[PDB]
Structure 1
Amino acid sequence: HHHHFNLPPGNYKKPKLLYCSNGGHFLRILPDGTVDGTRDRSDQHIQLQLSAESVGEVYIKSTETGQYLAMDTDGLLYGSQTPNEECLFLERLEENHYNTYISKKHAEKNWFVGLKKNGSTKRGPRTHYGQKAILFLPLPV
């Protein structure tokens, strides 16, 4: 492991909104495969079904479109029509409270799912432990 194994509480039974502490955006996977954040709680593309692969590993799937959150080779989040290596994230507790999502594929590089204050996703290399951008709270839909 390149990362700790503090796991967040909760389960994957229900879809979640992934609310980002940073700008208060919900992670959104748009139908065209774009990923960003929106503050609009009624948005139909922020309802995400997480599911476990191995313990601490998740897929993050748009319930609306079926797209999997994925991070590509250059660290960009995208919506994938099919689950692939890029779609696995290490879901961890952070600051004893939040959820973070580390690209499994790029775990050694500490590439996280992150939203900027302006609602744009962070590119993997731009994310780091310590950032607000990487901190998510899974909220009930």
Structure 2
Amino acid sequence: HHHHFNLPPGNYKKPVLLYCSNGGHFLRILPDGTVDGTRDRSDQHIQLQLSAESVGEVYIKSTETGQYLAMDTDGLLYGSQTPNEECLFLERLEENHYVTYISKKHAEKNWFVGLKKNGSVKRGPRTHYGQKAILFLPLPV
């Protein structure tokens, strides 16, 4: 395929917080489908549950609202009420430590889930290997 296959510790038993090392925000999916980041560890919308569709492919869903993280045709993240092709991400280890999530639908273009230092999500085309915005550390709740 288009990417390596170094995988991070596999465990989707319980929910996690996706902490972004670039700014230290937790990924958040709001009820209205908006996706962004917040530093508030107590936010009810940052608790996420990952599940593996195929080895190395995951869905990322809000435990509070049931929404699936998804990246659209123009690279914007949104919360989807139902699982679709835009909701699958390739979960990969990076720098032998961090976890990156690559849009499966747009894998050939290297579009990643990423957060800026100001807490706003990055648009797919603006992401790329080597950025700090793409580096996550899932924290078990």
Give the unaligned 5+ runs of structure 1.
none
1:8 Cα deviation after fit? 0.2
Tell me how large the CA RMSD over aligned residues is.
0.5
Looking at structure 1, the residues matched to 38 and 32 of structure 2 have their Cα atoms a distance apart, in angstroms, of 15
Task: Give the match's secondary structure for 1:37.
Answer: strand
Runs of 4+ in structure 1 displaced over 2 angstroms? none
Percent of aligned pairs sharing the same letter? 98
Query: Match for residue 44 of structure 1?
Result: 44
Task: Give the match's secondary structure for 1:53.
Answer: strand
- CA deviations 1:26-84 (Å, max 9, x no partner) are 00000000000000000000000000011000000000000000000000000000000
Looking at structure 2, the residues matched to 95 and 34 of structure 1 have their Cα atoms a distance apart, in angstroms, of 29
Task: Give the match's secondary structure for 2:54.
Answer: coil
Give the unaligned 5+ runs of structure 2.
none
1:121 Cα deviation after fit? 0.3
Query: Match for residue 85 of structure 1?
Result: 85
Query: Match for residue 59 of structure 1?
Result: 59
Q: How many residues align?
A: 141
56-65 or 9-18: which moved more? 9-18
1:128 Cα deviation after fit? 0.2
Question: TM-score, normalized by length of structure 1?
Answer: 0.99
1:140 Cα deviation after fit? 1.4
Looking at structure 2, the residues matched to 30 and 132 of structure 1 have their Cα atoms a distance apart, in angstroms, of 23
Task: Give the match's secondary structure for 1:86.
Answer: helix
